[PDB]
Amino acid sequence: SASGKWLDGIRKWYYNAAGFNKLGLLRDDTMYEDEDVKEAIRRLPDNLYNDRMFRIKRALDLNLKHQILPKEQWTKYEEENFYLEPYLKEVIRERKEREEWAKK
Amino acid sequence: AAVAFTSKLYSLLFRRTSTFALTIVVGVLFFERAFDQGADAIYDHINEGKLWKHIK
């Protein structure tokens, strides 16, 4: 039903309003590094880790220079990669399992 | 080649830190007096006729 197109519409609006794409950043780059997120980052393979580090340094440099990327290079909503989500879900499952053991 | 003003200024005065410091104290001695005199002149001039120094 149409409701899918409608919700995706508002979601795209919110994404462009947030503006981390103007700095060349992915969504999974912008998470705060709590305990689980750090453990998920530990699990990444080397290529993803290095790409993430450079992207973040580049955003920091731009922010230092009160500037943004050219529009041609902004991250687009329809071709983004949630590279960290899978690892995070596993980390959280493991912690939940341990908790559940601890109450018996 | 071109003995230029700021280069002479660097080589004579600013190259050595002690002499830089000496230059600074010497400049402040004279700046203070010149600056005071100018300010007092302007002030006195803005409100002639109303200060008791001259009414005296």
Place this chain on the structure above:
Amino acid sequence: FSICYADTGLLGAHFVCDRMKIDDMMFVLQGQWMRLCTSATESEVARGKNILRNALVSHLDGTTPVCED
């Protein structure tokens, strides 16, 4: 090292360090430079001249280095 060209050159130093000891080493090197610029003395200069003499005469041993020179 000194590396000479026709109208210019490079005059400096090169080193290898453990990652936790780069700062100290830079400090030591630049301190020696400042020392020579401000405080040199005759006794060390004499030693350096003798080292330089020995190098010059040691290099020119055998035909190849001489031809090259």
Place this chain on the structure above:
Amino acid sequence: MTRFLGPRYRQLVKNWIPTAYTWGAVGTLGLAWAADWRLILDWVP
């Protein structure tokens, strides 16, 4: 001490004499300028 009697120390002191009297000039003029010390400042044109 008795250690610091010798040629190198004489040479080393001679190396720093000029800087020493320049810092002396700096300190003297600064003191005078700071305390409006007329004994010295009355001779400045």
Place this chain on the structure above:
Amino acid sequence: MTRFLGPRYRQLVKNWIPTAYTWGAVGTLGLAWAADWRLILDWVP
């Protein structure tokens, strides 16, 4: 939280109840003795 609902936590709380009410007695009597609180101290023979 929702984590601390379960058997072990019930057992663990039961383990510490007595010490808890003993420290409560200590604090109450001390407060009263320290502030000469007549409301409690008038009942002490």
Place this chain on the structure above:
Amino acid sequence: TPMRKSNPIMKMINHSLIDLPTPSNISMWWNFGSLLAFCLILQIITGLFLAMHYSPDTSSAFSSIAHITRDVNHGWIIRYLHANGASMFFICLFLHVGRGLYYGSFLLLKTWNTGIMLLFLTMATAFMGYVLPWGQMSFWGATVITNLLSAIPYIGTDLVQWIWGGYSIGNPTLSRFFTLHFILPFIITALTMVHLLFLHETGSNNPCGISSDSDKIPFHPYYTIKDILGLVLLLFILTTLTLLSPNLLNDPDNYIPADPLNTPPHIKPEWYFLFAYAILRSVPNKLGGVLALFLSILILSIIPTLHNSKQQSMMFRPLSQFLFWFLITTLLTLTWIGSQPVSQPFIFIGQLASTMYFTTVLILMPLTSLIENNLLKW
């Protein structure tokens, strides 16, 4: 090793402000802590001088200040500097708090809690200085603030009479105000050192809310010169306030000495307090009013607990930003209401502003954070 690292005192200085790793990208909002420290130092110096001419006695306090401002050489400007420095101190304090609310730096729990302690201490100090001239406003301010403890149900009135040292406000209370106002700033100093000790274990947050360990620069020379620039600007503003327009923030009713038999018709505290006053004015019940007064500040301690967002900073969170600025306008509204008589329009407006302040901190922000999370699909 260099001497920079040869020795505990020197090595602590070095880890503090020479070789400390700072973020490259922090903005002007991070200059206000150093300005706070500067202000504390200024206040202590000018206070130690004033102290040597002031009289903590109700029969000469007023006239001792007259003596300071008329006969002591340049005493007038020392007075002016003290009074205006307090105002600058609170300006910087408010801006300093607001930064941390916006950029999510409350997640440094120890630093945040020590900050709340410092806020409380500074307010106490400022108020106990405000009553020393013993003018007509000073007297009634004292009276109200010392009657506040009557609201404690079982022991309150006795606490009031034990702080007064008598049946009423009087000579024995002024010396207490002066001793406490003398000692508090130094406790503030010590706690500031603890505050920074806690900070340097983690390092500074930054505008983007993401980890900056890939782009750290040393504190010296960059932030040394940056903070020096900030200080120069603060001094320009302070001088213009001291010499060009000294009466801008001044209150005429404190140039009339104290009269225990008459309260003036129109009452108004110092500006950095108006908002609390408004809050206190808004509850038709004594105990409830005082409780609200204190909760208005104590509520900062549970902001870390109500945090739902995946991201730390508001830089990338627009709905959040909208609410933030609405909160700031509520506080402006309370400040404006505090200035007005206790009459019906302002009564009603103040009550709405108060309910919206607590509402916003406790309910609206948490819920907007959840909506935001859902819009980004996590």
